[model samples]
Target: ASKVIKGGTVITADRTFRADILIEDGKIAAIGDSLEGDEVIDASGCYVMPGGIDPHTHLQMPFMGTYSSDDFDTGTAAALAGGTTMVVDFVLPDSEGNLLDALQEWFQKAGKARTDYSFHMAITGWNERTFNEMAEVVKRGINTFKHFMAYKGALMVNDDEMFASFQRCAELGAMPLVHAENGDIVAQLQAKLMAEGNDGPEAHAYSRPPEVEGEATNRAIMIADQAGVPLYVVHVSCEQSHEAIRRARQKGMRVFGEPLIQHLTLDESEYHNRDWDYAARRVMSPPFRDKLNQDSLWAGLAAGSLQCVATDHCAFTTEQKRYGIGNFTKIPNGTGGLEERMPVLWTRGVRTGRLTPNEFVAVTSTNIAKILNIYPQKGAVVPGADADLVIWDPETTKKISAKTQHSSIDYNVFEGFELKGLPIMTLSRGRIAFDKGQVTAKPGDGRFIEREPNGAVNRALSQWKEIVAPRKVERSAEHMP
Candidate 1:
C-alpha cells in the first residue's frame, strides 16, 4: 500500500520543513513537495516526525518473585498509542545461568509485540563464562549490555564484576549501561530503616539516598574510565548524578546519561502520599528523589547532561503494589509511563520552552536510535527509511488517567495532569498502527529488529566533544533569553 502525508511540517532532529511524504510498500519512498499517492492523508496544522523509540523498558519482567503486569501484547499497544514505534527492552540473565536461555525466553515472550522491538542483553555477573558469553550474544545483533550496580541480592554486580563487564564490552565494541546506585549502602540503609520501625513506602527513599546514587555513579564512571569503555548511566534521577555526568563529559569521557519521565515529572512527594496505595504505586528502585531534583533533571536535558528519556516502562497493578503495605521493600519496583511519555514530554518539555521541538525529538528518538546503533533506519523520515511516522497535534489537550490508558496496570502517576500535545495518527512501517484513539495492529505484527553495530561506538566516543565544556550555565528559564 502506498500513501502520502500531505502538507505537514516535517520535523527531524536537525531540520524542520514543510513537505509531502510518499510511503510505498511500508517504506518511505520519497519526501518532497506535491507528492502523489494512492491515498492522501491531510496533515496540515500537524507535525510529522519519526516515531518515538523507547530504549529502556521491561515487559513481563520477572522480579520480586512476580511478573510485571503488562505483557508484550498490551504493553506494545500502549506504546503504539503513544506514538512509539520501537522499544529495546532489557533481557537479564541470572547469576550462574545461561545467557542463551534467557534470550530465548525473552524472544518467545516478545514475539507477541504489536510493533518492532529489540533487546539489550544484561550481564548479571562477570565470571569467565559470562565474559565469554558476551561475545556470543553480540552475534545476536545486541551491541548494548546492561549492568545493575543496584538490586543487591537479585541483579547487582560488584565493582569487580562491573570492571570485568566494562573491559569485555570495550573489547566487543558494545556499550555498557549501568544502573548507578550503591547496592551495599542501600541494603544497609534498608535494614537500619526497617529495624527502626520505618517500613512505609516512604521509607524506600530513606533507604536509597541521593548521595548513594551520586557515589555509585562516580564509581561506575571511574570503572569505565579504567576499562576505557563508553558508559551509559540509566535512570539517573538526582542533582548529584547530573553533576557526575556533567563532569565526566567535560573531562572527555564517553558517558551517556538517561533520565526517566517519572523522575523528571514526579518526585519524593509521591512516595509520601497520604494514601498507602498512591504512595506505594510509585515504588521503583533508585526511588524518586527530592522535588528539587525535577528542576535539576530538566536542566540536565537543556544543558546536554542527559542524553535520553525513557519510561523504564515496567508496571504493576495496585493490588500487586499492595504487597509492600507493611514493608516497603516488598513493593514491586516499577511504574507505567509507556502511554504517557510522549505527551508528558511534549506538554512539559516542549510547550514550556524547556526544550525546542528539535531538541525534544533528539532526546526522545534520535539519541536512543543513535546510541542503540539503529539510526537513519528508525529515526529519520528520509527516502528508503522505515515508514514509522507520527502525526502530532501540538494544540490538543488530554487528561491522563487509568480509565483511558491501555496498559495492564491499574493506576497512572500523572492521573490528572492536562497534556498539551498528542499524536492523532501513528504509522508503523506504512500501516496505521494507531488511529483516532484505537490500535489497528494485530498480535505478532511487530518484528524483531536485527540491529547492526554501526556508528554507535564512535558516536559514544564523540559525545564528550559533541557537548560543550563544564561551564556553569544559567537555569533553563534564565538561559532561554
Candidate 2:
C-alpha cells in the first residue's frame, strides 16, 4: 500500500514547508499541495518527516568484561519507537584481532535489528597491519575509524598511534574519529582520587576534568592538521574542548564534532541525585556538566559550530551502576538512549526553539548522510532516496518507561520527563518497522550498504555516477588489529 502524510509541516534537513507527501513503491514521489496515497497518516499538527538517522550507538558492545545490555534486536526496536530509521554501530575487534569476524558478527546481529544500520570499525589495539586493513573496510562502506586518547588500558591509543592514525586516514581518505580525552592524565587523576577516597559521581568529572579534554582535543586537532586528515571529534562537551574544534576549523581543518543529548541536558550534579542511583547512570566519558554547559551547548548548536547532536547511546543499568557505589568510581558508564533521542530532542531542542525543526532534521539525518557520503539518497525525503519515514503525532505526550520502551535496558534515563510528542509509525526502506505498540520488520531484512571512495560525493550532480562505482571491492589489510 502507498502512504500519504498530510497536513503537517513537511520538513527536510535544510527546508520546511506546509504540504502533503505521497509515498509510492517506498520512495517519496511527491510533496506539496494535494498529494495522495494508498493510506493517509494523520500528521496535521505534527512535523511530517523522513525517518531519523542516528550516527552513534553501541548495541551488544563488549566492554569491561560485560556486553552492552541491549542487543541489536532490542536496540533497533527502541530506535523504531523513537523514530530513528538507521543507526551506525561500532564494531570492535575481539582479543583475537579478526576485524572481518567483527564485521560479520555485527552483520549477523543487524539481521535481527528492526532498523536499517551501518557499521563503524573501531581499530582498538592497533598496529600498522591493522591500519592497512582499514583500507578494505573503507571501500566496503565502513571507512570511519575510531581512536581514543582516554580509557588508558582500555581502548586507548597513545599520542604516537593517534598521529599515525591521522597519517593513515589522510592517505586513504577515511575519517579519523577520536574520543578525545587524555587517558594518561585521567587515569593518573582517577588513581589518585581513589587513593584519597573521593569516589563519587562528581569525582568522575573531577578526575577527567575539562582541562584534560581540552588539552587532548587540541592535541588531536593538531595531529589532524599535521597529517592533513579530517577529524570527527565524537562526543564533545565543554566549551574549552569546543574551542579546540572551533579554532581548528578556522584554520581549515575538516573537523566535525558531536555532543550527546544526555550530556547537553543532564549535568554531573544530576548524578548526586538523592542516592547515587542517578549518578551511576550518568557515568560515560566527558561526564555531564553544570547548567553552564546547557547554555553553551545550545549556543554552539545555534551558532553552527557543533556539527551534530548524537545520543552516543551506549548503555548501562543500576546493576552496573552499583559498581560505582560507596566509593562511586567503579560505576559502569553509559545509559540507554537510542529510543529516547528523537522525542527528547523534539521536545527540548525544537519545542524550546533552540533548534528549528529544519536544523533538527539536518543534524539527525542529513548531516550524517552527507558526512558518510550518502546524502540525497540515504538521508533525505527526496525522490530516488530510500523511503524511510516517521508519521508522528506531535500531539501525543508519551511517558518514558521500560514497560513502554523497546530497548532491553530495564530502566530509562529520561523516565517521567514528560514527552510531548511521539512517533506513531516508522518505515525503513518502504517497510513498516514500527507502529504504535507494534513492530513489523523482522530479522535478516536489513541489507548491507557498500560505500564508494571517499570524496566521491563531493562533486556536483553531473559527476555523481562517476563518483560512485557499482560496488566497493574487498581488499584485506596485511593483518588484524
Candidate 3:
C-alpha cells in the first residue's frame, strides 16, 4: 500500500519547497511535484515537516520515592499528539546492579510505547563493572552516557567517576551528557533555607541558583575536554550556564547546550505564585530563571550557540508532588511538556520572530538527530527517510489545558496558554498515529531505533586529537633519567 501527502510545503532544516511526499513500506518513496499514491492525505495549507525528536525525557522512571506518572504508552502518545514522533529517554541502572540487567528492565518497560524510541544510559556510579559494561552498552546501540552533577546522594556522580566514564566514552565513540549543577552547594543552601523557616516551594529555586549551574557546566566542559569527549549539558536555564557553553563553543570545543521549552517560555516568577501547589507543580532542577536569562536562551537559539530544545518531560501527579508538604527539598524535581512543547514553541518562538520556521525544524529535530547519530532516518523529509512526519496547520489556535491533554498527570504546566500553530495530524512510519485530536496508534507498535557509534563529529575530533597528541622524541634513550 502507498500513501501520498499532497498540497503541502515541505520544510526541512535547510530548505523549504512545495511537494507531495509518497510513502511505501514505512519509508518515504519519493518527494516531488504532483506525486500520486493509492491513498491521498489532504495537506492543503499545511507544512509537511519532520516530526520532533525530544532528546531528553523520563517516562515511568523511579525518582524521589515515586515513578513518573507517564509510562511509555502515555508518554509517547503525548509526544505524538504534540508532533513529536521519536523520543530518546534516559535509562538509569541501579547503583548496585549490572548495566545490562537494568537495560533489560527498561526494554520490558518500553513494550507499550506508541512511537519509536531510543535510550541514553546514565552513569550513576562508576566501578570496574560499570567500566566493563560501557563497551557492551555501546554495542547494544546506546551511544550516549549521562552523568548527574546534582541529585546529591541518589544520582550524583563524583568528579573522579565522571572523568573516568567520559574517557571511556571517548574511547568508544560515545558522548557524555551532564545534568550540570553544584549539588554540594545546593544541599547546603537547602539546609540553610529550611533552618531559617523557608520550607516552602519557593525555597526550591533559591537553593539552586544560576551560579550553581554555571560552575558545574564550566567544570563539565573542562573535564570533557581533558577526556577528549564531547559534552552535552541538559536543561540550561540561565545566562550563567549559557555563557559557559557559548565560551566553550567559541574555543572550537564540541560542547552542546539544550534549553528546555519550560525555561525558554516560563520564568522564576512562577515560584512566587501565592498558591503553593501552583508553584510546586513547576519545580524542576535548574529551576526557571528570570526574563534576562530567558532572553539569553532565546538569543542562543537564534544566534546558533545552543543546538537543541528538549522537554525533560518527567511528570509527577499533584499527589506525588505534595509529599514535600513542608520541606521543599523532598519535592520531586520535574515537570510535564511532552504534549505542549511544539505548540508553545511555535507560538512564542516563531510568531514572535525569535526563531524562523527552518530554524525551528533544526533545533527540534534535525540538530538532535545529527547529534544522536540518527540523521536522515528520524529527522528528514527526503527519499529513503522514515515516514515520521507532522502535517502542521499554521493558522489553527488552541488553549492548552490539562482537561484535554494526553498526559497521565492531572495538571498541565502550560495550562491556559494560547497556541497559534499546531499539528493537525501526525504519522509514525507512514501510519497515522494522531489525527484531529484522536490517537489511533496501538501500544507495543513502536520499535526501538538502533543508533550506530562513531558519529562524524566524534571521528573528526578524535582525528584532530591524534594529530596533536604528544610523542616520545627520537633520542629518548639518551635523554632518559
Best-fitting candidate, measured by lDDT? 3
User: lDDT-based ranking, best first?
Assistant: 3, 1, 2
lDDT of each: 0.88, 0.77, 0.92
Order the candidates by TM-score, highest first: 3, 1, 2
lDDT of 2 by residue, 10-77 (tens): 78877888888777786778877888788877778877677888888888887678777787787888
Model 3 stretches with alpha carbons more than 4 Å out: 472-481
All candidates: CA RMSD (Å): 8.3, 7.5, 1.3
Residue-level lDDT of model 1, residues 1-481, one tens digit each, is 5899998999998989999999999899999989999999999999999999988899999976778999899999999999998888999898864788899999998988999999998988867778778888888888888998888888999998889888788777788899999999899999999999999999999999999999999999999977767888999999999899899989877788999998999889887779999999889978888889899999888888898999999899988898888898898888889888888998999999999899888888888888887888898888998999999998888899899999987789889989888998899999999999999988799988877653556455545434643577568875676
Evaluated against the true structure, the overall lDDT of model 2 is 0.77
lDDT of 3 at 47: 97
Error of 2 at 465 (Å): 26
TM-score attained by model 3: 0.98
The 10 consecutive residues of candidate 2 with the worst lDDT sum are 457-466
> For every model shown, what is its TM-score relative to the native structure?
0.94, 0.90, 0.98
Candidate 3: residue 351 Cα off by (Å):
1.5
